[PDB]
Design an enzyme around this catalytic site. Structure first.
Site, PDB file in Angstrom:
ATOM      1  N   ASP A 183      23.712  46.794  56.579  1.00  0.00           N
ATOM      2  CA  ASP A 183      23.404  47.684  57.618  1.00  0.00           C
ATOM      3  C   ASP A 183      22.173  47.440  58.379  1.00  0.00           C
ATOM      4  O   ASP A 183      21.930  46.202  58.681  1.00  0.00           O
ATOM      5  CB  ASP A 183      23.519  49.306  57.189  1.00  0.00           C
ATOM      6  N   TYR A 206      15.717  53.208  64.975  1.00  0.00           N
ATOM      7  CA  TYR A 206      16.497  52.882  66.305  1.00  0.00           C
ATOM      8  C   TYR A 206      15.657  53.275  67.373  1.00  0.00           C
ATOM      9  O   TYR A 206      16.504  53.194  68.677  1.00  0.00           O
ATOM     10  CB  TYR A 206      17.486  54.086  66.233  1.00  0.00           C
ATOM     11  N   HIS A 226      32.286  51.379  55.975  1.00  0.00           N
ATOM     12  CA  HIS A 226      30.957  50.868  56.323  1.00  0.00           C
ATOM     13  C   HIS A 226      30.213  50.955  54.932  1.00  0.00           C
ATOM     14  O   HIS A 226      29.108  50.310  54.889  1.00  0.00           O
ATOM     15  CB  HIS A 226      30.165  52.070  57.369  1.00  0.00           C
TER      16      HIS A 226
END
Ligand SMILES: O=C(N[C@H]1CC[C@H](Oc2ccc(C(=O)O)cc2)CC1)N[C@]12C[C@H]3C[C@H](C[C@H](C3)C1)C2
Ligand SMILES: O=C(N[C@H]1CC[C@H](Oc2ccc(C(=O)O)cc2)CC1)N[C@]12C[C@H]3C[C@H](C[C@H](C3)C1)C2
Lengths: 546, 546
Positions: free
Chosen positions: A334, A465, A523
């Site tokens: 990730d 982010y 995921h």
């Protein structure tokens, strides 16, 4: 009523037995039958082998006493030993040939899981040979799976002396009828049986296991493939390194050999690698599993720019410097997977090899802002929601249990819709307030993440982010480069955000890229398919990172 | 007025320079003079080599561009390159040959010690070759000795562009006249000189160093041999392992390769190995320096029996198990030296090799109590004083500064009389209340021990002496054994309590024992003769523990 299970090492948990090798050497060397076994036992309680098993002398001190026992036996038998006869060579090969009896260990693990106390009671020696590491390695692998290990040479008693069985019962705090005892030598069962213990004579593993299922009422044979060995946080060595005045990184460490650094994603922990930490250490690697910056016991400064890719990679190099590591293999998943590709592009000399789980290598587009590329894909809408400071934090910190239960789900258990997150006004808008527990995780595992995020919160993790433009400008510097060091890309079939098709043009940038692909994997790769991940990583490490 | 010193890597801190190897290859291959240097620079600012130094492309991407530059140069020169011509082979050998210029590094270390800011400003590449580890290893050794490392390929600028010199000044927070700049290439000095910096052109090291002494007013050449690199506690990786519910062991860790465990004596710390931790890591070993039980950040239970040799050795094996180490080399001093001999006698499989500083292997006498043997030697009288709980603690904890200043002394600085301690009524009875600082230690080093003993106190450490009978009974079990694994005994000439003659009968128990002997060395071996200890340990490790 049974609550304890005792196993012998030689001939039970490890095969083949030493005595078996002694019988095979007589046949090979055309010696009289039993000659080697007679010299081995010569003298009984007053002989060299009893002194060896009681820890009075070491293996090397015993070898010349066993050799003269072989000559005295051959004098009586009226035979001549071969010109090249060596007890050392015979014993070295016998010890080397011994491997763990996997079905026997699997049955021991299942018994302990169902509440049994497990122990190894063995007649062994103080091994001082130059090759003693092989024995030490085997004992370590077994040790972690049992409550007790009792060795004759340490307590000064041997089987079948009755005092060693009294010592065993006092250690277990159990009465003899609550104990099942497995041994391949009949003589050693006799005293346990006299006390009232259930005994199983081991000739072949399958028959021994069938007797064990019958007496315990637990199915051991034909059982499903178990999950790999997981980590207990309180049993790990915890390391703390200061990389800069306000930043300290925490890591967990296990094994010896080449360094392998593991980098988790969002919103995770070092604990996300719990299934690979013991496997990679057992394959011959020194594993360092990080709490990335902003998470767990690592520092979590509130400033957004403290989490841009440039700062993050620089702190990882400092981490290697303070530990005295010139190189490490970097494996990420990730957000951590994105970071390891950029470590390979910016610091190739510090990276022995690089592997990513789910995350493809995405080169920066100089003709388009990353925020505009995010708006082109409705799947990435949750990223726009994460931009405003305080908004996503309040929703994710409001109920920690709900947050981790809604996120950590297998592919067919999805409760959130990652598109139209902004239009709805949150991630949990049409989501259950008390989601069901996914089959992938336990409540105890979820509570670890809840406890770790009670200290830090989501500010640090969300800031990874909030540097899209800054990361984009930094990445543009590497557009003329190629990744020419050993590399592995692992795709996960059912990751709906990081789809396998997003990695198809990677060969243009990493020409000798090796690939892995996991079917029916969502995921959360490490905890979704732990066995498959372990197999792909161990095979690649042994061929390309050695 | 000078306060900063900048050095180049190639040709200054590392010899020989790459350009030198290029000139030597033309002679060896009978090629036209300068042909290889012309291909290397072909194109200037728009050429392959500038793109390589700016980090636009990697070394492997550059190699084929340099090869075609060599062919184009040979076409014009009307010559044919040899059939086996390879830029890769030439560069691999050139990089491999480069070693640290010890006198240049020694001068850099002395300048920093006297308050200078030091930095490396170099034109280098992103090394992605299969042999890049050699370069990484060299950079790590240099890195720890300078305040800044500025590499062209990371900042996207190259020497001699004027912007890289502006960047250097902004990093140092210094004006150009406060900076001395050393480089072997005249072209790179020109822009630094234009700004007003003091420049030194490096042709040979000795002349370069003489110019540096003149301009700084500090003697660099003909200087005494410096002490080895020491540890800064706040820059170390700190590890914490729980070996049992109330017992946690703290250790400091550095390096990669075979594990080496260091065990300190009384009343010391992991910090007593400060001079050997960086040296052993640089020689290719993974060093683990312990805070033994009762000391520093390790647990300190008050019970006496928590410190008997049997419990102590068992916890050391558990420490290896929790870390995933099947074996380690064990090196001890004083009480730690006694412990490592018993680790070799009781757990030979977990010990790769064993070394003791000062402490001989003393076998137990079954016909005499240890307390009665202590009374036969007046030198050991302080041991009888240590027996009564609370008595020695009150005297040693009353003034911590005094305690460590009176104990940590070189052989000719002794202020205490270790005999008649009981008759006098204390260790500090006719001792100065404010002792002088020994030449062996600094006030800052003493304060580390004072700070560590403010938390624990002397109860735990003193309890190692309060198990004489219990240790004696446990040791008697090993009387029939021999130490047959690799072993080293190091004696210290001037230790008046652990005299070298007390080790003379050790060969009877350890037949292939190797020896070391240090002249003019007192009890505190590691800090008394650090260079000598390092040399003896590194040579023995490379021959017997590999
Ligand atoms: O956004 C990133 N991961 C999310 C983490 C949380 C997860 O939430 C899930 C996952 C699964 C499910 C389910 O099955 O219901 C629900 C929610 C969604 C994906 N990671 C990156 C990693 C790099 C750098 C940047 C852009 C791109 C490449 C993606 C961030
Ligand atoms: O007593 C032990 N060390 C003392 C530690 C403190 C030091 O104090 C000094 C040392 C030097 C000076 C000076 O130069 O003035 C003054 C005081 C005196 C020695 N260690 C052992 C180690 C093993 C096991 C057991 C018995 C035998 C073998 C000695 C304890």
């Amino acid at each position: 009523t049974l609550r304890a299970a005792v196993f012998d090492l030689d001939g039970v948990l490890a095969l083949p037995a030493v005595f078996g090798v002694l019988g095979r050497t007589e046949e090979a060397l055309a010696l009289p039958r039993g000659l080697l076994n007679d010299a081995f036992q010569k003298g009984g309680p007053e002989g060299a082998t009893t002194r060896l098993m009681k820890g009075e002398i070491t293996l090397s001190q015993w070898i010349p006493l066993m050799e003269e026992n072989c000559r005295k036996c051959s004098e009586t038998a009226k035979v001549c030993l071969p010109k090249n006869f060596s007890i050392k060579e015979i014993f070295d090969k016998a010890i080397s040939a011994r491997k763990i009896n996997r079905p026997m260990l699997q049955a021991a693990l299942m018994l302990r899981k169902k509440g049994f106390t497990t122990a190894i009671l063995t007649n062994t020696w103080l091994d001082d040979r130059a090759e003693r590491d092989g024995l030490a390695q085997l004992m370590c692998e077994l040790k972690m799976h049992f409550d007790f290990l009792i060795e004759s040479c340490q307590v000064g008693m041997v089987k079948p002396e009755p005092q060693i069985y009294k010592f065993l019962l006092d250690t277990l705090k159990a009465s003899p009828s609550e104990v099942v005892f497995l041994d391949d030598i009949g003589a050693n069962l006799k005293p346990a049986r006299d006390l009232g213990m259930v005994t199983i004579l081991v000739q072949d593993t399958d028959t021994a296991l069938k007797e064990l299922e019958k007496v315990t009422g637990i199915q051991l044979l034909n059982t499903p493939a178990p999950l790999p060995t997981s980590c207990n946080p309180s049993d790990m060595s915890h390391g703390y390194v200061t990389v800069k005045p306000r930043v300290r990184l925490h890591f967990v460490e296990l094994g010896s050999g080449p360094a392998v650094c593991l980098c988790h994603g969002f919103p995770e922990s070092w604990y996300s690698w719990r299934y690979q930490i013991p496997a990679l250490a057992q394959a011959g690697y020194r594993v360092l599993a990080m709490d990335m910056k902003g998470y767990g016991e690592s520092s979590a400064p509130p400033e957004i720019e403290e989490y841009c890719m440039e700062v993050l990679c620089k702190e990882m190099v400092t981490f290697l410097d303070k530990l005295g590591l010139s190189q490490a293999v970097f494996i990420g998943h990730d957000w951590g997977g994105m970071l390891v590709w950029y470590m390979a592009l910016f610091y190739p000399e510090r990276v022995r090899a690089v592997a990513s789980l789910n995350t493809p290598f995405i080169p920066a587009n100089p003709n388009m802002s990353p925020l505009e590329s995010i708006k082109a894909n409705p799947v990435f809408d949750y990223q726009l929601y994460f931009q405003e400071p305080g908004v996503a934090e309040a929703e994710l910190e409001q109920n920690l249990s709900r947050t981790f239960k809604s996120l950590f789900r297998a592919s067919d258990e999805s409760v959130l819709s990652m598109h139209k997150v902004c239009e709805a006004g949150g991630l949990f808008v049409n989501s259950p307030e008390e989601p069901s527990l996914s089959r992938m995780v336990t409540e105890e595992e979820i509570q670890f993440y809840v406890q770790q995020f009670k200290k830090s919160g989501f500010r640090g993790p969300l800031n990874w982010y909030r540097n899209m433009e800054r990361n984009w400008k930094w990445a543009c510097k590497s557009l003329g480069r190629k990744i020419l060091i050993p590399a592995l890309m692992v795709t996960a079939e059912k990751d709906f955000v990081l789809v396998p098709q997003m990695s198809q043009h990677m060969e243009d940038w990493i020409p000798h890229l090796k690939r892995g692909h996991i079917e029916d994997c969502g995921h959360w790769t490490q905890m979704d398919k732990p066995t498959e991940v372990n197999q792909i990583l161990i095979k690649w490490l042994d061929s390309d990172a050695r």
